[PDB]
């Protein structure tokens, strides 16, 4: 999920 932020 970190990649979308």
């Amino acid at each position, epitope marked *: *999920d*970190a*990649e*979308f*932020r």
Partner: antibody, heavy 117, light 113 residues
């Protein structure tokens, strides 16, 4: 209702290619990041690939990088996972997963990929 | 690579009794934006995973209040105060703070009768 419906799974030989698709409905597809996550026989969950809403940026785990290509066609509300050079370790249930609240929220029903001779 | 260590592996609990699942990460899940991206998910038999909890303690819409997530840094807990039969299945924590996203190995909750 948010709905994610995967298809295109099935039997594929080691080294060969298979393309999965996921049809999204119930939300504005182009506003959401999307990801593929796989689940193995031991029920381990493993992130595979992610793509941002505009399709400009793609992310891959070290396991599939250089082998898989995630993409999306927004006008068709469809997410794709092009798999190539498949390995027996790639055998699993593949889920289409929506990214929101800072996290993944909706999961599809999953499509089964079996890499076998 | 952030290792998510989830315990116990299996849990057997009587209806009406509390259940508690632990999730520990190999690094802090506090992001620099001040938020903590720790999530919990439930996969019931014959069903696709469904999110219960995000940002450590925030309940997904329609999740009953008997579910409560807590913790900070590297130590997190999911507590169910009063177990119902519908709660059975596989629970996973997973983190969205560092790349790549990583999942706990899951905890199978069984109803004891």
């Amino acid at each position: 209702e948010v709905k994610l419906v995967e298809s295109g799974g099935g039997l594929v030989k080691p080294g060969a290619s298979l393309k999965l698709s996921c049809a999204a409905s119930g939300f504005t597809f182009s506003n959401y990041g999307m990801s593929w996550v796989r689940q193995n026989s031991d029920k381990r969950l493993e992130w595979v690939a992610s793509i941002r809403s505009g399709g400009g940026r793609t992310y891959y785990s070290d396991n599939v990088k250089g082998r898989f290509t995630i993409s999306r066609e927004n006008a068709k509300n469809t997410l794709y996972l092009q798999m190539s050079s498949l390995k027996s370790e790639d055998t699993a249930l593949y889920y289409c997963v929506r990214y929101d609240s800072g996290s993944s929220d909706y999961w599809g029903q999953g499509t089964t990929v079996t890499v076998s001779s | 690579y952030v290792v998510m260590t989830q315990t116990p592996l299996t849990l057997s609990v009587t209806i009406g009794q509390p259940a508690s699942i632990s999730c520990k990460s190999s690094q802090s899940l506090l992001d620099s934006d001040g938020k903590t991206y720790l999530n919990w998910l439930l996969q019931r038999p014959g069903q696709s995973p469904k999110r219960l909890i995000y940002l450590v303690s925030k309940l997904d819409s329609g999740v009953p209040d008997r579910f409560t997530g807590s913790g900070s840094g590297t130590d997190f807990t999911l507590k169910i105060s009063r177990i119902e039969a519908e709660d059975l299945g596989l629970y996973y924590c997973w983190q969205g703070t560092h790349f790549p996203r990583t999942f706990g190995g899951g905890t199978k909750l069984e109803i004891k009768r």
